[PDB]
Design a protein around this ligand. Structure first.
Ligand SMILES: CCCCC[C@H](CC(=O)NO)C(=O)N[C@H](C(=O)N1CCC[C@H]1CO)C(C)C
Ligand code: NI
Ligand code: NI
Length: 184
């Protein structure tokens, strides 16, 4: 049961480290931690539960954000067609992606970053991710759009990368030729 007081903030060294892979089959404690990421993402999205326990809504979360330097991520997001993508994975990795990029026109926010950081965060429009689930299933997920963006954001945390690292340092709102802007 993670709450905002368990979330570390930008500046904490753990957020810039490369997380350690998780030995499989997982220990009961590593399963507990991964499950806890997924439960926080789901719960943070019920505004009543968020207010009750002091959570901030997130559509994804990575172990390093609660100061656990291990390769674990959770994702719970609905795409533009109304389809839910809910996952809790050990050792996720993007094995291939599109050359074409996309980005949210609103920019991105991070639970560990307490301040408006303006600008487009460039992401691949399509990706393929492998990982192992809480029940030992090895999955290969072909994702696009917002779900693909969320996976890139959480996997980035496991490599010590923050979203603003992918914002153009010269003109944050540079419009990339051919890139898909996402935002209605
Ligand atoms: C989009 C990629 C980032 C998704 C994950 C983050 C939460 C996080 O820091 N995970 O490590 C989030 O929910 N960010 C939210 C976010 O950026 N929103 C959520 C809906 C889509 C986008 C707003 O444009 C903010 C509002 C807290
Ligand atoms: Ni590549
Ligand atoms: Ni984040």
């Amino acid at each position: 049961m993670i709450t905002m007081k368990d979330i570390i903030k930008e500046g904490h060294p753990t957020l810039r480290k490369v997380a350690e892979p998780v030995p499989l089959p997982p220990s009961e404690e590593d399963k507990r931690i991964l499950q806890s990421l997924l439960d926080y993402v789901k719960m943070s999205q019920d505004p009543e539960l968020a207010a009750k326990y002091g959570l901030r809504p997130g559509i994804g979360l990575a172990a390093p954000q609660i100061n656990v330097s291990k390769r674990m991520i959770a994702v719970h997001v609905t795409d533009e067609n109304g389809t839910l993508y809910s996952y809790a994975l050990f050792n996720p990795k993007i094995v291939s992606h599109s050359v074409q990029q996309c980005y949210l026109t609103t920019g991105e926010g991070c639970l560990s970053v307490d301040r408006d950081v303006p600008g487009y965060v460039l992401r691949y429009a399509r990706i393929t991710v492998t990982g192992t689930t809480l029940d030992g299933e090895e999955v290969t997920l072909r994702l696009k759009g917002l779900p693909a963006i969320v996976f890139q954001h959480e996997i980035d945390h496991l490599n010590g990368i923050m979203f603003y690292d992918r914002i153009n340092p010269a003109d944050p709102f540079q419009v990339p030729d051919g890139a898909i802007p996402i935002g209605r």
